[PDB]
Design a protein around this nucleic acid. Structure first.
Ligand SMILES: [Mg+2]
Ligand SMILES: [Mg+2]
Ligand SMILES: [Mg+2]
Ligand SMILES: [Mg+2]
Ligand SMILES: [Mg+2]
Ligand SMILES: [Mg+2]
Ligand SMILES: [Mg+2]
Ligand SMILES: [Mg+2]
Ligand SMILES: [Mg+2]
Ligand SMILES: [Mg+2]
Ligand SMILES: [Mg+2]
Ligand SMILES: [Mg+2]
Ligand SMILES: [Mg+2]
Ligand SMILES: [Mg+2]
Ligand SMILES: [Mg+2]
Ligand SMILES: [Mg+2]
Ligand SMILES: [Mg+2]
Ligand SMILES: [Mg+2]
Ligand SMILES: [Mg+2]
Ligand SMILES: [Mg+2]
Ligand SMILES: [Zn+2]
Lengths: 102, 57, 69, 155, 31, 50
RNA sequence: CGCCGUUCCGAAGGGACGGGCGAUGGCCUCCGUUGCCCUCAGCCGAUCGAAAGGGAGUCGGGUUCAGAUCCCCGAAUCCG
RNA sequence: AGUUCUCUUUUCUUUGUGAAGGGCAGGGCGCCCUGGAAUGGGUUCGCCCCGAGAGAGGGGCCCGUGCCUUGGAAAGCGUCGCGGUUCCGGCGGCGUCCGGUGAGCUCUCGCUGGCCCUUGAAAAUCCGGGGGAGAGGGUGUAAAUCUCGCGCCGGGCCGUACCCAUAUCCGCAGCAGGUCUCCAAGGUGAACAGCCUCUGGCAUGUUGGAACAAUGUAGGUAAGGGAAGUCGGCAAGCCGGAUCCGUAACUUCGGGAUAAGGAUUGGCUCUAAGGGCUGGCAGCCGACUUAGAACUGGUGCGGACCAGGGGAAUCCGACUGU
């Protein structure tokens, strides 16, 4: 069947702290299917972006937490993990939030 | 892992202190105290070694 | 606790003098009608929503009714 | 102040050890005047008392090693300390073989590949250690069936 | 409650080394 | 121990009440000589024997 | 002062289904109670002796500064 | 939630359902009925079973602490978000999911055996049966009667805190002593051994600082020699695991025996054998083992820990035990 997951970075991108397109590119070149990070398993995992939300669809098994594993990884690359937090918004969405600081 | 304690003051492993584990709705293992195992009646013939049927043990 | 299978015997159990109140619990798959008698909490498990409303309106008068959420 | 009490009650409310209770070092005055579990529950909700995570004890090292052992690594003559029987008792090895070989004969008899007369003869040979494993037994049954079939033809 | 708050408060408390003798009793000034 | 008899628990209680300091007004009585309760007991220093 | 002894040199049962007599009662109809008599009765050893032996029947959730299978909420059960 | 310089679809945490009732798995039967078995068959790890009735069919019963169900999601927990007096059993959102595997360990249920010149409590208490003295009513508003299902009332007295032990107990004490028990994680490993670690706990054991003389106490190492020391090899030291081989005198034939004496042991990459489920074949699942081979390092490899020195004799006492 079809498994659909989304990432909500609206709050940071609206603050101009991360770019969706740069994030979008990162996912394309990393998402591993059968341990291959190049071809998205042969287009089986399609990655579609919106204005501030990135959606990932896979016709094969694909863990939601895997998106959390890469998302946090990408945040550390950009030295954002000390500000942003990845939380699940629903059964199929993660969103990025701010720690309650001042 | 979680380790158990007796729920009574009898701290010895006697024949009247046997227990069994039980997971509760609160998601913890406790001790429940079993009742002794009953025995069906033996035949009055004093010969047949088996116990009687149709009777609660 | 006792489980009741038929509506007929639930209605009767609600008419016992020792029935104190009826608890109506709605789940995603069924509606449970639980009545507290002297000894047991009898339950009627209803899988049809329509039958539930018909029953709720026909309980004996004077039995305390509580809806549970 | 002296937060021995708050450490004790927070541990009881959090259902963890006193070693996992964390008190905000910047708020000891607020915590100091929490002398009840109702107030401790409020400080827990507020975030002046938190439960520290379990210390990491990862099995990754032994999971990696156990995978190596399944391929034969770290299992040579120099890595054994108990006798061969202690590592794998003979009785258990015998028990597995007997159950396997009797299961085969039972199924072969039921499927009428052998008759009850050949089964009984083979059952007592199996008990005699004649056949080392399943395959050796199955080949012998094949050889027996052919010689019997030849005799049937000659009759 | 977010668990990273444990780190944040610990590091903040470790900053008291420079302000010995005038440590603010409560940082949550409101109330 | 926890397992106690009524007689023992009662004898213990009387020992509990005797173990207190004197009233301070006792000092101001006319012919008074007592300065402190000289019959105080500690559960560790000296034992009851029962 | 006492000791021995524990069924041994003992008239060691105060009980009962039922039956017969009276006396009392009350939902005075008839049933109860009570006293006497008839009948039936081995136990054969008073009593003590175990917070590990035998021995019916309670579990879940919450709750305290300190008590909880004991308090509260709920759901059960044994005995009489 | 942690790490993310690089790598890691990664590592860690967590992922409920009580008693009682019902239903159903599963286990057990020295229970029944048909029937009549040698070309004897059935069967276990071992056994053991049968004309006094086996195999094969079809049934009955006991325990079901296992799963489902009423309990019961309302509760609990995980997590994110809002509230309040804010010391509220506060309120919401989502979740509380699916499989596998084992001579694994702990408890328990059961079947079958072995040991005894050892045979491994009693009573309270409760139950069934045999018997048939009696009782009940004359066709009914039926009666005596009921161990059935509901309903009604009550359960008095005493104990209960905490310590339970390198500081709550006994040793004059917060004494390295003594003092009965239950539960029991990961790795290595034969292992409840030793070594490291998680949960939980602790603050080095009635003080600290600075030095690093002698003499000590406890640990080590020593060229060449190797008991020359000493009453005496005291003390220390050698050996030590496991696999393969080999093994004397004597013997009460059981032993002696790990006799004695050798070889091997790492890491890495492979090969072969050892199974279940489904429908001499095909597919899918698997759990640890054993054996062999190549390559490889400064010959190091039971790398720490754990871990027998051996032989030839004499005296005494058979041995185990005290
Ligand atoms: Mg007892
Ligand atoms: Mg259960
Ligand atoms: Mg053997
Ligand atoms: Mg003392
Ligand atoms: Mg007793
Ligand atoms: Mg048969
Ligand atoms: Mg819930
Ligand atoms: Mg009869
Ligand atoms: Mg207590
Ligand atoms: Mg020291
Ligand atoms: Mg010190
Ligand atoms: Mg000390
Ligand atoms: Mg000292
Ligand atoms: Mg030397
Ligand atoms: Mg030398
Ligand atoms: Mg000499
Ligand atoms: Mg000399
Ligand atoms: Mg020596
Ligand atoms: Mg010898
Ligand atoms: Mg001797
Ligand atoms: Zn019989």
């Amino acid at each position: 069947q079809l498994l659909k997951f989304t990432l909500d970075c609206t709050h940071p991108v609206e603050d101009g702290i991360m770019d969706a397109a740069n994030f979008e590119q990162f996912l394309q070149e990393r998402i591993k299917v059968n341990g291959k990070a190049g071809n998205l398993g042969g287009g089986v995992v399609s990655l579609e972006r919106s204005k501030s939300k990135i959606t990932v669809t896979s016709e094969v098994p694909f863990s939601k937490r895997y998106l959390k594993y890469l998302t946090k990884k990408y945040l550390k690359k950009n030295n954002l993990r000390d500000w942003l937090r990845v939380v699940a918004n629903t059964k199929e969405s993660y969103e990025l939030r701010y720690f309650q600081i001042n | 892992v979680q380790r158990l304690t007796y729920r009574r003051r009898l701290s010895y492993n006697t024949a009247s202190n046997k227990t069994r584990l039980s997971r509760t709705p609160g998601n913890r293992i406790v001790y429940l105290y079993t009742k002794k195992v009953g025995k069906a009646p033996k035949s009055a013939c004093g010969v047949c070694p088996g116990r009687l049927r149709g009777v609660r043990a | 606790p006792r489980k009741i299978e038929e509506i007929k015997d639930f209605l009767l159990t609600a008419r016992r003098k020792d029935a104190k109140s009826v608890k109506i619990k709605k789940n995603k798959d069924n509606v449970k009608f639980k009545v507290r008698c002297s000894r047991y909490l009898y339950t009627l498990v209803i899988t049809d929503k329509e039958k539930a409303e018909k029953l709720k309106q026909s309980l004996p008068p004077g039995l305390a009714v509580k809806e549970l959420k | 102040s002296m937060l021995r009490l708050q450490k004790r009650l927070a541990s009881s409310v959090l259902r963890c050890g006193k070693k996992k209770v964390w008190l905000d070092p910047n708020e000891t005055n607020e915590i100091a005047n929490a002398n009840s579990r109702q107030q401790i529950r409020k400080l827990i909700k507020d975030g002046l008392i938190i439960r520290k995570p379990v210390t990491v004890h990862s099995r990754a090292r032994c999971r990696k090693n156990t995978l190596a052992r399944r391929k034969g690594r770290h299992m040579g003559i120099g890595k054994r300390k108990g006798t061969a029987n202690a590592r794998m008792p003979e009785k258990v090895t015998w028990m597995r073989r007997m159950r396997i070989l009797r299961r085969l004969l039972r199924r072969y008899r039921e499927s009428k590949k052998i008759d009850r007369h050949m089964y009984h003869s083979l059952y007592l040979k199996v008990k005699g250690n004649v056949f080392k494993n399943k395959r050796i037994l199955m080949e012998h049954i094949h050889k027996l069936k052919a010689d019997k079939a030849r005799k049937k033809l000659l009759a | 409650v977010a668990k990273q708050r444990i780190r944040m408060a610990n590091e903040k408390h470790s900053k008291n080394i420079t302000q010995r003798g005038n440590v603010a009793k409560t940082s949550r000034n409101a109330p | 121990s926890s397992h106690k008899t009524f007689r023992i628990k009662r004898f213990l209680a009387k020992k509990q009440k005797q173990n207190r300091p004197i009233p301070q007004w006792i000092w101001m009585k006319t012919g008074n000589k007592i300065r402190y309760n000289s019959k105080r007991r500690h559960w560790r220093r000296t034992k009851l024997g029962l």
